């Protein structure tokens, strides 16, 4: 709240209680303003055409997604090794989504 | 620290000398003074358990090249290693360090 705050601190670190493995991490986006706010709507009409298996019909709406189904996202490579290595399998439990200090330019 | 490798201890864990008492065969019916050096021969058996709590110094490093560890190679061979040979005869093919994690100066 307020210019002169920064709305959160940046977490990366990489826990293991033992049983647990609560796996921070932060990344910088950027996001433009795609398709100059409008709703433009896709096919290979207008892509220039495709073959029958290729047609497709959508819309490209433009708002932007944070993905982070990737598991590098979250593991860095030590702690992958530490999963592998002496672990007979994982599930996530929980999730955590704190996007924070925005600045618009 | 003994040069051989392991602790120095003041008071290391002590011997445990066992020996199976003298008994003597068959003793003359008259007097005789010496140390009766006519003893039957025989031997023991048993089980020995020694059970020695170690403990752990667990590692914490904050290393992202992934550690570097022990493993057993996975090549075919005639025999596992640390397995026994068709023989019976319990075979090491190497000595085993104890230091392979990294810990920085």
């Not at chain 2, 003041?10 to 008259?30: E, F, G, R």
Request: net charge positive; with cysteine; charged share 20%.
């Amino acid at each position: 709240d307020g210019v002169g705050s920064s709305s959160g601190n940046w977490h990366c670190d990489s826990q293991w209680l033992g049983d647990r493995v609560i796996t921070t991490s932060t990344r910088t986006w950027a996001l433009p303003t795609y398709n100059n706010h409008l709703y433009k709507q896709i096919s290979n009409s207008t892509s220039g055409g495709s073959s029958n298996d290729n047609a497709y019909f959508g819309y490209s709406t433009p708002w932007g997604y944070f993905d982070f189904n990737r598991f590098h996202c979250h593991f860095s490579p030590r702690d992958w090794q530490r999963l592998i290595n002496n672990n007979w399998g994982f599930r996530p439990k929980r999730l955590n989504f704190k996007l924070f200090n925005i600045q618009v330019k | 620290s003994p040069l051989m490798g392991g602790f120095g201890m003041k008071h290391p864990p002590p011997q445990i000398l066992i020996k199976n008492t003298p008994v003597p065969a068959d003793p003359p019916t008259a007097f005789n003074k010496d140390k009766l050096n006519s003893f039957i021969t025989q031997y023991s058996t048993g089980q020995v358990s020694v059970e020695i709590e170690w403990e752990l110094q667990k590692e914490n490093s904050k290393r992202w090249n992934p550690e570097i560890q022990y493993t057993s190679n996975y090549y075919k061979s005639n025999n596992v290693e640390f397995a026994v040979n068709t023989e019976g005869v319990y075979s090491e093919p190497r000595p085993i360090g104890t230091r392979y994690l990294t810990r920085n100066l």
